[PDB]
Amino acid sequence: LAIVFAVLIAIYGVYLDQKIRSRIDGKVWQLPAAVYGRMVNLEPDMTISKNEMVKLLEATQYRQVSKMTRPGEFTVQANSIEMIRRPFDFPDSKEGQVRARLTFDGDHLATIVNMENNRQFGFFRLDPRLITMISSPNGEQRLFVPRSGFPDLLVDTLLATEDRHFYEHYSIGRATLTQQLVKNLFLSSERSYWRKANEAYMALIMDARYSKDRILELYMNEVYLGQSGDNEIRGFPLASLYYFGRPVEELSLDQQALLVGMVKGASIYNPWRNPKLALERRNLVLRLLQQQQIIDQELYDMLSARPLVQPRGGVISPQPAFMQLVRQELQAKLGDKVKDLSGVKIFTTFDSVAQDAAEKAAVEGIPALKKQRKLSDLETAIVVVDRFSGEVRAMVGGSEPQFAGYNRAMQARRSIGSLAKPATYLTALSQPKIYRLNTWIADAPIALRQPNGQVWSPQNDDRRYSESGRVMLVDALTRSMNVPTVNLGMALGLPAVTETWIKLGVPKDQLHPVPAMLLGALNLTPIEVAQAFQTIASGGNRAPLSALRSVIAEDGKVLYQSFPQAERAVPAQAAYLTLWTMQQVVQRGTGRQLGAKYPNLHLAGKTGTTNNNVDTWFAGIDGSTVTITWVGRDNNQPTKLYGASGAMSIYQRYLANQTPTPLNLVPPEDIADMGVDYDGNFVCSGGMRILPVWTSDPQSLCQQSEMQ
């Protein structure tokens, strides 16, 4: 015989083992970067409510139930919630499940108690939601999860199917789990008995040098389970989140049957296109295992009478607007030397609750404005950032945030109009010896000769002038009076005002120092406006906006860490006086519709309008965040909206869709509340009006009083 044949196949097998080594002993796959939202820490004495906490939990993929049994679940009671915080690999320290009770004392979090030992936590970590993945060059997207990470039952459901009961190394006789691992991992497409035998040879070599758990650990992360546009969704972990919005470790049995059922055929059982052949395949799996010992008959009818929820969505590109900022910030910080790495973890500043509320305000708000005014193509952008740290919490780049290609929060450069006014008042108030809230500004006809040849003659909103010819600075800003603003600004000088703009953090090449700049001849994107208003909201510290918190390697190596880098930009006292006045605009000025609806928030804000309302804006500052809202048309035509009411309606819905933090303005040093009389002069005691004043010696009133 030519038995040497068993020899060149033996060497072909030994040399085959050479390939099933360099592959599995290292990078099995190029693993895409995972993008996570914010990690929230809870603390006792935190200002939050139970209903507020419920929303944060549901936004973080938690499910409210009657009785808890699994991670990612929680129960509500009269004055508290009980949850099972799911396990997560926090950069700071890996954590398992924790059964906690958060107890609420009305307005705040009273206690957080470990249900295990009945003791209190000093702070408690909530895991971050997976927002998205960063496209993998392969076109194949995976979320690696170790063996242990898979629930016993989905492994049982998996074994109850494909590899019927085991796979010890009979199946062929009657007429393979390791057999298929190589099929997807090493082999070509289809037709070949040689393929059938080539994998069969790789299967023995495989299951010879690698453990049981290691085979299905690679398998449960390799199987094709979906198609997101032109990206392969494979692996049970990523499929779970993609096909249920919940981790693999937390799938219900009926959801485990579906995924598994979709392994045989992985595209025709797709619950989107045809839910019928998927429902039958699901129930089929439910009857497959029902025969073996794992499944009861009574519960079977439940799982079968258990429709699919199922994400009923496409999710091809989650949070397109915010992800633009993320991609942009990654390039700047780490460069192109990042996607070279596999299994990278990106921790962002994204707030799921805020995003939900902004998106809802945009989606419902815009059609409402179009109906109430008979419009045809109205658009909007919303940016939310943290008051003090400049972290970007939310970004809405269009009235249809779900499906976005053009991101208006970052790309739509638009005249800010009267939103420009605080810069001027901030410039003035930064000089406490000369300009104060009670300083009188002329309000009379203006005529400014400019570079050839026409004369610039700005008018008040109502084409009227103050009967006295003058108005106090406080009231000019409150009422967004055009004429006093130009008189103030021209007296301060366009260079001084322009320098305030740079300190506030606006792009320097957008600044053109001519009179109209004072009234908003300044074109910015919403994210750039947010920077400017964050600087005044923080109390004068410019905190560069960012969407990244950290970037960790698969092994836990820190590729990037964010450190606080706020820069003192304007005096805190001037920032304060400007904000106090912006509280006036919201209570009694142009923003007064908002102060009437949310009196207890004491919001500070500024309306923005342009000639014929081409662009409308609102900038609202609460206790914790700055929200910029823009409403207008892409073609740059008049909106027909009147006043900042369009941007204030969107913002008002934003405020209603979440739980805003009251703004309680704490006065910095050397701020004193002082009375003035009707003439506007300071008085020692009394005064019909009280205004805060930057002074270390309120005895500029003994001086004022000595007029006699």
Side-chain angles (χ1 to χ4, degrees), residues 320-325 381 395-398 404-412:
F322 186 82
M323 282 311 299
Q324 275 194 6
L325 178 53
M395 179 172 293
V396 159
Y406 187 55
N407 178 192
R408 297 163 178 82
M410 289 175 70
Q411 306 187 66

Side-chain angles (χ1 to χ4, degrees), residues 492-503:
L492 288 165
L494 293 167
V497 170
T498 289
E499 189 189 6
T500 297
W501 274 124
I502 297 159
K503 295 171 183 186

Side-chain angles (χ1 to χ4, degrees), residues 532-675:
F533 279 94
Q534 179 281 319
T535 298
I536 134 88
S538 62
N541 290 134
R542 185 178 63 258
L545 304 186
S546 61
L548 300 171
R549 237 297 179 269
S550 65
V551 183
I552 317 301
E554 57 178 309
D555 47 14
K557 176 192 170 193
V558 171
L559 307 174
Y560 170 87
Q561 184 80 253
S562 160
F563 74 94
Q565 48 197 181
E567 208 94 29
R568 166 59 56 192
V570 288
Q573 293 84 172
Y576 169 86
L577 300 167
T578 302
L579 250 7
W580 192 89
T581 310
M582 285 171 279
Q583 294 190 305
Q584 300 308 283
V585 354
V586 157
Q587 195 174 39
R588 75 186 296 212
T590 55
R592 59 187 172 269
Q593 83 137 82
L594 279 179
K597 293 203 250 74
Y598 303 106
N600 300 309
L601 302 186
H602 314 102
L603 281 357
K606 186 72 191 62
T607 50
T609 64
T610 54
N611 200 207
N612 273 34
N613 313 119
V614 163
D615 295 292
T616 64
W617 298 81
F618 194 77
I621 303 162
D622 78 10
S624 294
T625 69
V626 181
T627 308
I628 304 308
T629 301
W630 168 86
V631 181
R633 311 176 67 183
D634 290 339
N635 63 13
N636 286 279
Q637 297 171 336
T639 55
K640 316 308 190 305
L641 301 168
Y642 263 120
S645 290
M648 274 190 293
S649 59
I650 294 310
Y651 179 60
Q652 86 202 18
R653 288 166 175 264
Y654 172 80
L655 295 169
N657 283 333
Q658 34 111 17
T659 307
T661 297
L663 182 52
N664 294 126
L665 265 189
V666 180
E669 294 65 32
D670 289 334
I671 299 297
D673 289 333
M674 300 184 66

Side-chain angles (χ1 to χ4, degrees), residues 353-389:
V353 180
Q355 187 69 21
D356 286 351
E359 287 183 356
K360 182 167 234 57
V363 176
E364 303 173 351
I366 286 300
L369 294 174
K370 289 162 66 177
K371 259 300 176 181
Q372 194 171 0
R373 333 231 111 179
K374 320 288 267 56
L375 317 195
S376 54
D377 61 54
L378 199 60
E379 274 306 329
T380 194
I382 303 178
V383 186
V384 184
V385 318
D386 178 283
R387 181 175 164 210
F388 294 109
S389 76

Side-chain angles (χ1 to χ4, degrees), residues 163-178:
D163 238 333
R164 284 68 217 185
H165 16 297
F166 211 31
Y167 68 160
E168 191 186 346
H169 300 93
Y170 108 83
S171 255
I172 213 295
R174 178 269 283 169
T176 190
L177 208 286
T178 169

